Amino acid sequence: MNRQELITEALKARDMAYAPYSKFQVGAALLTKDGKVYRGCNIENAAYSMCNCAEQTALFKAVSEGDTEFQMLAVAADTPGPVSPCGACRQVISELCTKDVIVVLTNLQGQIKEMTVEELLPGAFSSEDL
Amino acid sequence: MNRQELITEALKARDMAYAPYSKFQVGAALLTKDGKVYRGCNIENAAYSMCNCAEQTALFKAVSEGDTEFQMLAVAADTPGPVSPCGACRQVISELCTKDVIVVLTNLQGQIKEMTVEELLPGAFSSEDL
Amino acid sequence: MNRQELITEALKARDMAYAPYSKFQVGAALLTKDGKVYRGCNIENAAYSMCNCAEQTALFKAVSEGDTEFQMLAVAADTPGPVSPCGACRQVISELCTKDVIVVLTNLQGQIKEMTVEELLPGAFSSEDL
Amino acid sequence: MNRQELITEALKARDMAYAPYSKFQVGAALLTKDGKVYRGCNIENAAYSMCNCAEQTALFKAVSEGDTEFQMLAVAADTPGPVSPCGACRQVISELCTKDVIVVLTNLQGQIKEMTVEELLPGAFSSEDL
Ligand SMILES: O=C1CCN(C2C[C@H](O)[C@@H](CO)O2)C(=O)N1
């Protein structure tokens, strides 16, 4: 399961998205240490604040299943450049993923940006601060 | 899959909860028309606003899998009376579940409150309002 | 400061709304025991989950100023019937407002629905449950 | 209104915080181009996902008043090092503040970290992506 394969997973996950308000579909694919893949997509709501992002859907699914050891996360959307996870998502990622987990960002035209969880949100607010 | 059985599902789902901040674990079990059960649990974050509830975890998992037809939702937590879904959850439920879906609320002592999605949040803000 | 006057406050507050994504402007006016009025409006974000509602804006402003004793809350939007506070808002209202506070809901055509905070979200999840 | 003076504003704002759940109070002070200061503090809820951060409180207050031109934002909390805005906050900041706005982070022991809005969340998901 290389990153190109994980990207295809995210691309398929994107088609399951429920985004009738923004018409902006996003897909994510989370790869565990054991090699299992969890797909995620954004799910919207008439009350915009309740919208859930693809990255969080994938992470929530994994964690709810008992999987907490990850190695890579791929995210895709039809944006100009590689899709940029929103701040809230980066925060969730920084909590549920270890600092060296690889985050692969891409769009629907082959643009690819790779970075670690640490780089995604340097010095992220954490439990240690509490 | 009667409600008592769906409640046991929620009780097991509760044990998967990631809630180190509140120490308040919640579990949810969503039953589809076809009879499939999706388990959910709350997942917290150092940044409290990023916490995700059990009900939403279950619904997000189902929807991401292509399942959008539900018949019942069970929720459980160690509260004095039947657990009360927070407002945000009721909003998500009102969007992803049809009005007559049955919502079963309970705690860890056999208290049970049953109501429909409509009753859970009467006249909920919806797409029609937009 | 009767309810009709508080409604006009909410109607003016609505014009300050920053909602370029939904194009759905909402206004709110919070009246304290001492008679002070706090205006609120929805403020959106490209990342939909970060959108903040009018009711919350008004309540956050008041509380940040040291005002925590309220008597009435008015909310207005261009909806078919009286605007319905989203679940997340009802949850915040239920925490920051005592159960006797009067909530006045209306649209831009004279439709008015009045109810207490308790009625807005009966048996709302609260600190007592934690 | 230099940064040291804006920091004192944030320190005072912090005392207004409503955070009975985390017992973690945060303060923020937003300075407009015209020199006006808006104070903010975190406001919690029994349902953790509804918690609002200091930075957002200050920004929401300003915007609701018609002020949309800012020059600096100060944030303070009792953390080991300068307080780190959570991802959700950085996202809101990136939307409501121009990229040149200065963000001043500090704790209660004189540690100070200064950076621009762009640096706070480089390549932040924005309307252009939609
Ligand atoms: O973090 C990324 C960027 C944002 N989108 C979302 C949520 C929402 O339904 C839509 C518009 O913000 O894209 C995601 O799903 N993931």
Ligand SMILES: O=C1CCN(C2C[C@H](O)[C@@H](CO)O2)C(=O)N1
């Ligand atoms: O709607 C219900 C009530 C609230 N809890 C949550 C989220 C959070 O982790 C914790 C404290 O609010 O319980 C749920 O998970 N579901």
Ligand SMILES: O=C1CCN(C2C[C@H](O)[C@@H](CO)O2)C(=O)N1
């Ligand atoms: O609770 C009410 C209903 C929802 N709207 C919002 C937030 C968002 O910007 C827009 C669409 O959901 O209306 C409010 O501002 N208040």
Ligand SMILES: O=C1CCN(C2C[C@H](O)[C@@H](CO)O2)C(=O)N1
């Ligand atoms: O972005 C910063 C970091 C997080 N805190 C919050 C919200 C919540 O009440 C508490 C614990 O997450 O600190 C803030 O208020 N601002």
Ligand SMILES: [Zn+2]
């Ligand atoms: Zn996101």
Ligand SMILES: [Zn+2]
């Ligand atoms: Zn909830």
Ligand SMILES: [Zn+2]
């Ligand atoms: Zn709302």
Ligand SMILES: [Zn+2]
């Ligand atoms: Zn924050």
